[PDB]
Structures are given as structure tokens and as C-alpha cells.
Amino acid sequence: TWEVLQYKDSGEPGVLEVFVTINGKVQNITFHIPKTIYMKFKSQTMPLQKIKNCLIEKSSASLPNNPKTSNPAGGQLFKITLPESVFLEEKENCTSIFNDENVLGVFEGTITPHQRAIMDLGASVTFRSKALGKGIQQGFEMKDLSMAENERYLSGFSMDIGYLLHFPEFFSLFKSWGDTITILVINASSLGQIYKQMFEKKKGKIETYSYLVDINFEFVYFKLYRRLSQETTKLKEERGFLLLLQSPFITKLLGTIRLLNQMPIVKLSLNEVLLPQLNWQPTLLKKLVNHVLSSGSWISHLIKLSQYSNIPICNLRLDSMDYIIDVLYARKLKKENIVLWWNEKAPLPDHGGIQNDFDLNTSWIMNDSEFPKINNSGVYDNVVLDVGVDNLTVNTILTSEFVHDAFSNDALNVLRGMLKEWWDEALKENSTADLLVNSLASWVQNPNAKLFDGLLRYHVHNLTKKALLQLVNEFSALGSTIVYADRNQILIKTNKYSPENCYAYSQYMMKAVRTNPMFSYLDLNIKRYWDLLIWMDKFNFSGLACIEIEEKENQDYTAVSQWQLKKFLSPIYQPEFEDWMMIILDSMLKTKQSYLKLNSVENSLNGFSHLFSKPLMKRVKKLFKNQQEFILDPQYEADYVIPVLPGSHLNVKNPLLELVKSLCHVMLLSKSTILEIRTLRKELLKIFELREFAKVAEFKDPSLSLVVPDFLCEYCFFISDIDFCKAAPESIFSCVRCHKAFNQVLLQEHLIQKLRSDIESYLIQDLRCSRCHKVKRDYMSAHCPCAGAWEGTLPRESIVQKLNVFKQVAKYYGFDILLSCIADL
Ligand SMILES: [Zn+2]
Ligand SMILES: [Zn+2]
Known about the structure:
The PDB classes it as replication. By secondary structure, the chain is α+β, with helices and mostly antiparallel strands. Helix content is 38%, strand content 16%. Strands 15, 16, 17, 18, 19, 20 and 21 form a 7-stranded antiparallel beta sheet that branches. Strands 7-1-2-3-8 form a 5-stranded mixed beta sheet. A hairpin with a 6-residue loop joins strand 9 and strand 10 (172-175). The chain is globular and about 105 Å long. The structure holds zinc ion (2 copies). One zinc ion is lined by residues 713, 715-716, 718, 735, 737-738, 740.
């Protein structure tokens, strides 16, 4: 039994070196790992070439189901284990088994011996030789003798640590058993006071991690760039001490300090650190001191994860949740008869090389990322509750030959069982299992993770679609009306009129929803209760809300007013719009209260416009007179300037016209008091010299839309679709739940990817006949056999407008790489 610190493959093929903790101190020993690959060679009879020394066997493993691979054909799969040295020597010639006729690909050729050893063998290494000296003077061979023991406790750790840090010339070093700090080219006093301050502020953490790392140290602020080599050598002969690395140039530091390859090291890369251009000393001091005093908690968490997941310390990292998923899932498949499709240094599933080719169905499943939603505008007098839906993907996964696009059923079942056992373990107070459950969805979406298949992602998305529509149907089974739908928010119209009466109703409804077997794992929370709502859009609504219904007391009612349409008004009319919106909301509240006091038309709201008709008309007349008087004055030209915003496309002249048009369209949403609104609108339009059904008196959307789907937040794992045009500022740059700023070059890259996928989709479109909508089925042909000329499924003007709005968006904010992307066209 031995605890492995690190695995590492040698330059010679099939040879690996390990820093292991021998019964005394650490020790290094050499191994030999053969390779294992899977072929599809010939149909039933093959040129075996048995004279070559290797192991061959016709297996019956489960191959991945590619959409393009529709013909099973010959299925005599072969399992070949083979040392990599002879593989490299036989790669030279062509007359060999690897390259012949009827060779259909290699399925497990990109798996290093390091990976095979760390998945099958693990850190808990032991021997059962029962020639140990002869096996340690040379590399101990493992394929004949290998096994993994239990790993409940990895090791009782009591041994020194190292520390080398960099902040873009801020190379820093520290020793646990040292007593000095020197920094490469007021500071000392600030350093001492800050260290003492965070000492008392983290006394408890320091005490509870002192057994890992333990004190004032000498400070120094140091032709000087060669001292890294000297310090590394000095620490090499001073101790045998794990190294902690923190810099954006880890590979550069490893390649420029030759001594760093001689000891096991643990990397803690948290890059993207920048300088404030002024007073960088306090912030850098804070960074270094918090890193120094949090390394103990870091190593505690790392040893927890390692001794939980049977992974060596040096091969772990704080944010490598996907790696553990890959390791566990891969070993669970290895004990199974399923080929791993393992991939390295490429975000594509391994399929034998077929995956390099371009195929239409793969292209369409790659770019199918948009998610639908439900919006039913109108004015509601019934109470409406706002709920949130959580843990949707996990419940969707856990709940539930002919089709070539289907994902493999066996892998789906295995993943469901693994997720179920993780859920059960996390229920029994396991933080690691909880973190794994939280990170599962991010692992699924992220292509950078290995064992990633777009087919599986599409399968999950399709299942989520079906589950959401089923949930909507279930909510519709009882008395309910869905106002808005999304992956995160659902608004439901309640039959009753008083919020106080919906307490037991809402609780019973949510209880019944939870008790449903397919909705067992969902998490439902109620946020707000609505008294009177004017809902037309996600970004444009106003109403009266109470947070939560209390007992024996009248609830607190607050008014909300979110209207992007207000921004597109003239600067001088926005106060008028606000005031009149407030007045009309007050009138509707008053008439609903009066009707309720009395006891597809509803007398709750009918007759509400009689309260404010004449003052509104007089005010509109006064506004028209003043605008007529002072429109051509130069000093008054400032307040009549129509603002320009991203996504604006309408070109119009008279501001009062849009003011009244919006003020009438907001009222027209009644869907039950149409005639009164129409009479009022005609009377308003009579003030101008216009007519009831004129084109210029028609309201439109004063903005376009540009939505980015499946936007992810690293800190909170929140998934939402962000709109680059309709959304207000100071929300594009920060996550909704957690108030953490977003990275900007990520936004630019995502916009560029969306644009390029759009262009590709336009360029790969199909052709449809004009008269009969049948599709083109021939490569060369002038027209349909019937009458009619071909037209494209994707019209040109649509993509032209899309590019226009990309241009406007990129111009509004600072987006330079996107501008360069435009320029290359
Ligand atoms: Zn977030
Ligand atoms: Zn036709």
C-alpha cells in the first residue's frame, strides 16, 4: 500500500514515473504501461500477421452510435493490447496491420499511459509480487501485477510546503519553515500590519489548519531574474516539500526552471490578475496575504477531494470538477463493455476519425441552442403568483437501430444510476457529492470537458423541452392560466381575487406538484404575489405587488414600473408618460376595488377610463399647442431630440404622435374593454388631422432583439438567455442572482460565434419551390416540375437586418474585436 503524489509519463513510450510516499519519505519509481486500442478490421477474414508480437482478441464491446454511421456492415471488432515502443517502431512501415484495406478507424488511440494508469489503477497502489529489487532498479511492469486497495484515508500528512507566486515583476516566494519574504523588482510596515490584521481576522481558520500550515516573517523588496534558479536549487538541497504554483504562465515557469521537474508539484492556477495602475501595493499585499493564509484551507479541501475520489494530489485542481466526472464515468464504463470514446486536446468525441468529416445532421444538432418561451399579454385583475423552478436538468435526467440520431441507451442508463447514487450520497451529508451535483450541468454543457458528445447535449436539451411542456400541461390541468414561461420563472394566473385567500390553494397546488413522480426532485419557491398586473412583455410591465401574505394584517402593496418603451420617448415627454401611467394604474385599482365592494367581459375594470378622459384630452391639446409653437426654435431644439439606442430601426418625426400611440397601446391590452379604448383613441387622433386606421397611427415595437442562449456564470452556475438589445444596462455585465461582474472578451467571443453560426446556417440552407412548398430533391435543375421558381428557406433581408443590429450593438458599447470581425467581411 502506497499513496501516490503524482503520475507522469516519461519521454520513452510506455514508461511512467511516480513521486510516491514510501514507508519513510517520498520516493520515485518507474513503471511500464502498454497501450490498448480497438479496431474494425476486415469483415470476417483478415490478414492477421500473427508473427508480430502482440495480443489480439475479437471482442463484443458497445460502439458509439454516430449519426452518419447507418450501416453496421461487418462488426468483427477487435481488442488489441500492445506496448507503445513496438507501436512506434511499426508506425514507420506501411505494410502493417494498422493501415490496410477495410480498416474503419481507431477508437482508443489517444489515451496516454498516464490516463490508463490513473483511471484503472488509482493512487492506492500496492504490489503482490510474492525480484522487487530487480523490479525497482528498472521500471516495474504493471500489466501483469496491479491492483487498487481501499482509499478511505490517503495519508497522515506532516511535511513541509513550498510557495512560488507571480503577479503580472512581482515574483514571490515563501517557505513554511522559513522566516523571510523577498519580492523581486512604507511597504514593510504595511505588510506587517496587514498580516497581523488578517491574522486576528482569521484566527479560527489559522488554528484549525495549523496542523497543515502554521507567524511574522522578515520582509524584503529586491540581474535579479536569475535568482529563481538559485532559490529552486537551494530548496532542492534543503528539502526533498510540495510546491504551490500560482501564475498565468505556469508552462513558461516550468520550461524556464529546469529544477522544477525534479519534485512533485501542485498547481493552483488562478490567472487573470491585473494592476490598478496606482496603489498596487495594498491590493497586491491583500492578494498575497489572503493566498498565504488560505493555502491551509485549500490543502484541506484538496486532501478531502483526493481521499474521497481516489485521485493523486498533484493531478487535482480546485475547479477541475469535470475531471472527476470523467474519471469516475470512465472507470464505470471500463468495468462495463462500452468503448470510452476518450479524447485528448480536442473538444470532440472520438469516433475513429469519422468525426473529422462535415455532416449535415451533426451541424444542425450543434447549432440548435435556442429555447422557446410562452408570453400571453393582457391586463389581469385576478391575483398572480410568481414562482421559481430549480434543479430542472437533474430531475429531467433522473426521471426519464431505427433512429440513428439517438444517444446510446446503455450510457444513458449508467449515467442515470450514477447521478442517482450521487443524489443519495449527497442527501446523507456529503458536501463533495453536493458540489458534484451542482457542477454536473456545467460539465454537460461545456465542450472543453473530455468524453463530451454533442448528441448527449442535444438529448438532454430535448428531454428538458419535453419535461417543461409536460409541467406546463400539468399546471394547466387544474384551474390555472400560464402568463409567462421560462427555464427559471413561471407566472400563473389564479382563479381567486384576494391574495389572502390563495394561501392554502397555493400550498396544496405546490404540494401536489411535488408529489408527482416525475416532479419529485423539483424545487419550487414562491417569490411575489400580484394584485393587479399589466403584462405585455418580460421587460415591459407595471403592477401592484405584495411580497408575501401575512396573517390578521393588511398586506404591504408596492408599485413597480419597468418600461423600456419609456427610453425611446423624447426627453421632455417621459415625465408626462410616467405621470399618466401612474394615473391610469390608480384608476384601474380604484375601479377594481369599487367592483369588489359591490359584491368575456368583466365589470372589475369596465368603465375605468371615465375617470381621466377630459383632463387627458386637455393636456394633450396643451402639449400639441406648445410643440407647434416651439419646435423650430434653436435653443429649444435640445429637448425634442429623439434619442438613439441599439436596436432602434423606426424613423419618425413628430414625438407627440409616439407619446399618444404608446399611451393608447398600453391601454389597448385590456382585451375586454376594446370599444371604449378605441373611442378614446379616435377622439385623441381627432386632435391631429389624422384618421382612425391610418398607417402612421399604428403602433410598432420601438426596438429589435438580439438574444444569446445558454449563457453560463462560473460563480453561480446560473443558466439564462441574455438579450443584448432589449435589456437595460448594468445587467449585461453582471449575473442576475450573484452580483458578480462578467468577462467582456467572453461576451465578444460569444457574439462572434453566434454571428458565424448564423452565416454558416444561411449558407447551408435548403431550397423550396414558390408555388408548392415541396423541397428541392435534385442537384441540378432549373425549376420545379410544376410551375414556380426556387426560393431560399432563409431570406436574405433577415440576415441583412441581423448584421445591421450587430453593427449597432458593437457601435454602442466598446467592442473592438467584434468590429474587427465585421471589418474582415
Ligand atoms: Zn452567477
Ligand atoms: Zn413547385
